[PDB]
Amino acid sequence: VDVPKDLTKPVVTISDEPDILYKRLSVLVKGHDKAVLDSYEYFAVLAAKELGISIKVHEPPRKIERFTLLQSVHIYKKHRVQYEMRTLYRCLELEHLTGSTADVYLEYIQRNLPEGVAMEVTKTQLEQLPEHIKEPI
């Protein structure tokens, strides 16, 4: 019963400047947890589908960085402890999205980025030739 009668809407103003165009948006998420990456992939794909963005998903081969340390404090050289770090990847390639759509979608998924998951978003922007390169001089 105690529902808000009216709700204030955020102000989104249509600017008079043309909008950027993104041919590709490759969001490569790196983590240590394949399950976390899979859950984030599900979330991002569902959000993109809801927003109408075309999305494909790839799994770049993981990386395992290993190194060795002396197990004992003082002399037992032959005995070592080997540690490793696993970086698992998930690449979400979004295609044919405008600047505003890319901004909103990226803000969403980045704010919701899990702890321990880093992101590298490569944006391939579409441009026209500058007027100063149209004609020979």
Add this chain to the structure above:
Amino acid sequence: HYVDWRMWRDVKRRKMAYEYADERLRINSLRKNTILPKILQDVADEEIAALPRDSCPVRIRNRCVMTSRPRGVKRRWRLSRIVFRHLADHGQLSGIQRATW
């Protein structure tokens, strides 16, 4: 309040090296080319030698930031092997796990 006097000395060396980095860079640039006159290069050599010893970056020793260990230090985490093993074994270093393959 550093771990020991060796760590304190290294901290002072790092501070002085940072302070004198630019001057050393310029003078070494003067010295490290065959273009300028060798007399000018020699005066540059005597200047760079006259700079204080602790400003030399080579004197900086990479020590563990928690036990001042001068060797067995992983540059990435700046922790000696012992401290790094302690943290990793207790599971307080993200993503680091025992290697088995």
Add this chain to the structure above:
Amino acid sequence: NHHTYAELMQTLRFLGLYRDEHQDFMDEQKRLKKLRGKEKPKKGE
């Protein structure tokens, strides 16, 4: 900045908002040594 860390935690202990178990142990040992007669000599004797 070990200076910053040590001074901050020492000040917090003195204010009573940080319980330094290690420093309490050291203070207890020093007090017991003082009772035992093992007290740090002054700087001129």
Add this chain to the structure above:
Amino acid sequence: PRRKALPPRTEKMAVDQDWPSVYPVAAPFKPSAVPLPVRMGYPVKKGVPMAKEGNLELLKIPNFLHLTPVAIKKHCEALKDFCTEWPAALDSDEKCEKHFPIEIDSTDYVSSGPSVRNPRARVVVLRVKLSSLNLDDHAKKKLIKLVGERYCKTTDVLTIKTDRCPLRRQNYDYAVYLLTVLYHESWNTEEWEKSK
């Protein structure tokens, strides 16, 4: 005497409540709030996985309870206002390339820490097919010779990677300037060019 902890508020949750209301944002797993009998931890011999109350393993998991399918659908419905429509005309990659010959690649890095800076964010890559530039035979040959390895003949693509300036905008401007000067010089003719 002492303070008796209240019963968990899950007892008061109806089976048809508003989970997005329960967890709007990313928050740690709260056993008293999650109305699931979820268990975790490797069981002891003839035991069972540890319950959720005090379960540090569940506390460690980066849960997604704030992102359910319903919550995501509602969030995207709210966010649809912010989206602009893709130009329908250039619906295909060929049309994209034809209308917008220059492609600009720039990377943003999202890590965790007090500092957002990342030196790799300043690099800007500019890709353009020479077929898209109005160059004659001589101008094209001179441009290819000038760029050198930056031009891949197989794809016929010139790639200018600028990372000299600290800022991404500066690098983008520098890449555009490099394209302009390369084009104009390639169209230009020098005296020594005769001795080919």
Add this chain to the structure above:
Amino acid sequence: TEDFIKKQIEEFNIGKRHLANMMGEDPETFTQEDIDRAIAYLFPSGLFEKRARPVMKHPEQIFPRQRAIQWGEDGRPFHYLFYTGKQSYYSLMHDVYGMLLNLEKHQIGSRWLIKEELEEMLVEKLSDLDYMQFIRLLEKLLTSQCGAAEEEFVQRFRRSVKQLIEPVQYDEQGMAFSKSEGKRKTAKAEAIVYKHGSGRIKVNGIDYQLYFPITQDREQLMFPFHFVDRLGKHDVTCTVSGGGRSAQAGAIRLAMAKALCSFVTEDEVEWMRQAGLLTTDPRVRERKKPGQEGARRKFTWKK
């Protein structure tokens, strides 16, 4: 206890309805697979051990089978073999012996359950020798012309226990072929074998005698076709990447054999398998170990 398990089941039903509401699915048609998927999504855990990962299962699957109290309020146990301490096991033995006595008076599909399975059935802890005794008795029962009346009982303790030919595809020109792949060490080879050909083998676009100037590798290429007596009958196009010359030759050999399986008869395919032409050599380089020279070589001992 029983009341505890009942409360747990009620908790599970309520939580299952809550999880169905959370995921938006229908509470009625929410299955255990759906619950597992929803939990895996909501609580992502990368722990390798599946048991250590979050689980929201039925209390029946979670809690171990607890043996109910074996006596009533008066203190009298329920089973006349209670004081043996293994009442269930000895009841089973007694029943088997009775069946054997009745049988004596009157007159590659399954296996025997393991001791763990028998213990699970009997909710009791057994021994190796007890299990062997019971299995010997059951085997005697099986041999003793056990009819349906006895086989129905016996089967309660029974547990049930060829190359995959690729489909033949067709190119644009209507020629039939088969595609296969094979890996040897680090070498991976994809081989396309045509139904009809003059024996040509083009590896990476190069003729095989040029790609593999080594007679051993050419012999390895020959081995599958020569075995099935199909030299000069098939054309092959192979693409091999990774490894050295010998690893590449072995990988191509495996891929060619698998592809040719589609064109040889089933008996020939089985003969190739028996000759070992379809097995993926699992021998790969063994990792070096710390504190020793190599995978097995140890540092020179200093007495």
Add this chain to the structure above:
Amino acid sequence: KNRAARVRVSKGDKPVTYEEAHAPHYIAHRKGWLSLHTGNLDGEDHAAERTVEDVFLRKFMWGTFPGCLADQLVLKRRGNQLEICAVVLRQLSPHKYYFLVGYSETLLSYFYKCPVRLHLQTVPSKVVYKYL
């Protein structure tokens, strides 16, 4: 004999939590990580700074909630938000819990120049995974 982070067996009177009960080789196999950040991923930076901050945070919380932490902290880093999930005991008074939560949040936020949240989950007594 390996000693690293192993609670050696006893007469069966030593209670141990899930973390303590598991040796180092069970990290990523049966137990997770107590600090989650992107420092240790390939191509990421500031691993050393994150480690130092984690160590200081653990010591500071241990000394600020004395005899209250029922288990190890969990340090999560999201963007620049730092979330400390701490399991504590239902012994100290809620007034003092709230005072210390506000105090720790503010002090750590000002010290590390980042928004810090401190989520307390209270238990009656330390959760015992097994008796060693």
Add this chain to the structure above:
Amino acid sequence: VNRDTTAVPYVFQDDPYLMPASSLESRSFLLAKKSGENVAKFIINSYPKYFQKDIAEPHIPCLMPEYFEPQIKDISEAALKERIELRKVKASVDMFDQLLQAGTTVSLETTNSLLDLLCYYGDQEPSTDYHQFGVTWRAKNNAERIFSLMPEKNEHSYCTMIRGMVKHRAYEQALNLYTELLNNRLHADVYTFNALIEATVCAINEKFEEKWSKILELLRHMVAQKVKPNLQTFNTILKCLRRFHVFARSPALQVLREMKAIGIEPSLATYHHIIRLFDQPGDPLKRSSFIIYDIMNELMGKRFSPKDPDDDKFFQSAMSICSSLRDLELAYQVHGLLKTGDNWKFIGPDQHRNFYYSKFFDLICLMEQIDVTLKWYEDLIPSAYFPHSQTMIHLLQALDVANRLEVIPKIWKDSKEYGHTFRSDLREEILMLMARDKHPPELQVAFADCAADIKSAYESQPIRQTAQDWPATSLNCIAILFLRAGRTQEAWKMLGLFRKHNKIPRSELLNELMDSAKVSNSPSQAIEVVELASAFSLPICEGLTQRVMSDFAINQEQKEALSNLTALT
């Protein structure tokens, strides 16, 4: 995302142990958290050198230590300006005195800022981290001394002096300084005129006509000076006129109409002041009903922005008047106004929010169908507020009116959760409601379980340090509920507490005990009840002895005891 109806406000730790379980604990927990934050900030500002390392990119200014000590020790106008912006009254006064003695010129603007500070803070150091009744404007103060010593005085200096005097309740001196302003032929501002109106109404206890004439004269003087009145002026007028009530009613409407004509849009503070002026003790139906209806009509669906410091009381006053009028529809309209847009932020402090919601829910329980009442209960408590014992009592009364007593155990559990476990009034109400009339066996057993829990709470009361107090009515009701539900053993064990506390049992309880004793064929229990009745010397005992003799076969010993009791009779 809407509000979480099962969760306490977000500022609290979402843990069952740390979740507040009462209004008092809510307020105390918030105060403790704020105190911890204050201590942290005090430490940060006391030892700033530990927090000067900026590892934040982008830089975060709000997470930097604040420096309050002046950094310009040179005796100059620049250093004095540094101090005045730092708001250091004593240091600024000393530096101004030293500079004046040195003889160097001091700018009029700088002296004006010094005034601003001194006259606003009453020559008292503004409260720092660490180192109501009456008038604070001292006769001899640094502000007045510097004003007199000032070489050149300007309109703004006089305005600030008057405003400070009025703020510190120096109304007569403010009026005087206005008089010298006029004598010196200077023009004041709207803020000075607002302060002067406040002083005019707060100076002397003159009659309404005199005060109104003075206010009109001041307004005419403002018009002559061409100073344009602002929203604050009219709000001060109404707030001052509150006192006269009836005499000020109509002119308040005149002032509101003047606001509308001028274009100074009325605010929530204005509507609050008008409503409180018209809400005089007596009969609100005469004028308060109409005024509140009209105000709600005007305010319907109007997002509000903060325009006056007192805008955050309109909702409290509106809910108060709605509760007084018992107009549930008007209360709903006010609630919808609060919920519209972002109006909810105007509810006000914790006490105001609690009072608003307590009135709203009491009115709901009084004048709404029980199903909607329960829906509102669930939505509001504990998410909105923590109820008071009186609100829970009103909820119980509404449940009784609607004849839905099957939820009384739920209400008792909720009371325990919200901290009314040991409230005598609530416990008595619940017990009376449960034991008033008989009910089907299921309701009876539920009531018996609730009564057992209530008895446990009574036993475990914190008053146990003091001698345990058990009301006789509560004892009777608990015994009756146990007997009706079949816990005759517990009733028999409880009967001893009657003698222990010298509490008079109930005739209905005794009758039920006799019925149970006859059912069980327990002459000993019947004689025990008769003995209790005789000890309490109830008149009904005379006939009850005969009733027991007739119903129960009497042994020789029981007959001897009854003969002794009759001899006592």
Add this chain to the structure above:
Amino acid sequence: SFFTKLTADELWKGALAETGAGAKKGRKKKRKDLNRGQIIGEGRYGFLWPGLNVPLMKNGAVQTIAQRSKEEQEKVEADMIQQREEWDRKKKMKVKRERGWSGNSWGGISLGPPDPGPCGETYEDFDTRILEVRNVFTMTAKEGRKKSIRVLVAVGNGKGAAGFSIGKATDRMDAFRKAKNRAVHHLHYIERYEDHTIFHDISLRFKRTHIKMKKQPKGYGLRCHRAIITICRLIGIKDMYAKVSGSINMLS
């Protein structure tokens, strides 16, 4: 350095040094919990933090950060030291044990009633007396010389029922518990003449021990080997003479 500090548990473990080569075969220090008397929010500067070490609300007004005067802080520290020294003194002081046959001998010492049984069985009526404590050593293959305690205990109700048992354990208290719990399952019943003595003179030899017990009149007392006196007090015999010849082995 702040980062080199450890916790109280680890510091006490290292300092006390219970585990170690020394303790392996015995080839003192007291663990003081320094957090016992400390109060959260109490420091040497005497700050009064509202809500942590002082009441949040004072007379309806939110308190504010204040500092105790120097003399007040001195008083607080003096009180803290007083509590510390009182606790230490009450820890150091020990209660005088009631000795058995000799001051340092476990023999003759009471152990209390046997532990209650499972099936609603209680032996509060029974008293337990230690007759011997030995430290038997056995050489094991790995753990060199191994130390164990063999205890002999006698339980009895003073009304005829009396039994005895031997308990073996690595720990003295576990040995006592084992022996006294096993004794109650091995109770003899002794016939006492007139509830104060034996029915007739008894001369017996068990292995190499001769016991010559003489029936005696009332008030004669127990003139017996001290162990026999203990066992007779357990059984319920008041008057008897007893001479032990041969080996005086306590168990025989």
Add this chain to the structure above:
RNA sequence: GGACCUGGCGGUGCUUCAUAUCCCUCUAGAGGAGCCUGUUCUGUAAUCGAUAAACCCCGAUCAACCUCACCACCUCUUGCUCAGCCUAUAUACCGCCAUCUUCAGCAAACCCUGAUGAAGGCUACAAAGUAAGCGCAAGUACCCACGUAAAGACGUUAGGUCAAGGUGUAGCCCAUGAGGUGGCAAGAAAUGGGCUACAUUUUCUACCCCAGAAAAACGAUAGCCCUUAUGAAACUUAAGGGUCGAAGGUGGAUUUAGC
């Protein structure tokens, strides 16, 4: 002193074994040469620790200055620290480990036997053992369910480390603390490990395997000279070139590793 119990030991018996393992058997090595490196000894004013298996390219995934804790000289004294000490004690310890372990047993709590001694506790056609827990196992990582990792309890060697850090005890406080400059860190000689070789299954070249030359030459990563790289500092570090073409001619008993 007599008789026993437990353990250790037996140049102690029978039986079955060791699966890269004890002998033979198979392959490649060390033991012979030069060089690199560690250690012992000598030398010096010039560290310390490991030092039978379980030390000896070991702490060091590393010493020109720094590192550095050593020596010579000089300088400072509430000293970076609400001091400091790489000062003694690893035979007080925590911490991390070697070792059997390339094991499978350690076991609390009970019960029983021995006359109720230390002690012992099994026979499956079963004769007093039941056992939580730990370990093994299982589960897990890598490429399978194999293999390798990982794991490997209780204990043995007062095994190693006070020099990772912390710490008990003891010791110095105008110095056993702190700072600066300079300096040793070498070879009489022995010995451990590794690299290069002694060649024709080899050397140089082209190619990455269908060749041409070499062949008493093969053989230094050493020696000497020059240049370059890093550095403030290079005869004393690395790389390259030049120059030289050395010992040696498949290595004694003995010994290492490999399924």
